Write a protein that binds this ligand. Structure first.
Ligand SMILES: [Zn+2]
Ligand SMILES: [Zn+2]
Length: 60
């Protein structure tokens, strides 16, 4: 039960607790990120997949 604690979106630095958004499978903050600012961020920064592990954001 180590999943406890609330993760924070590495983009806007805000706790999400469990925003269901498969955008990457890293081992740090990236593992948890709001699909709101991430999906839109990569769109503004022009990105389709995490440049840390090579996983696509896959946003709705
Ligand atoms: Zn990643
Ligand atoms: Zn966020």
């Amino acid at each position: 039960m180590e999943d406890e604690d609330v993760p924070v979106c590495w983009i806007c630095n805000e706790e999400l607790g469990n925003e269901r958004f498969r955008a990457c499978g890293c081992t740090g903050e990236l593992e948890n990120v709001h699909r709101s600012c991430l999906s839109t961020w990569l769109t503004i920064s022009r990105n389709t997949a995490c440049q840390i592990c090579g996983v696509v954001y896959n946003t709705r």
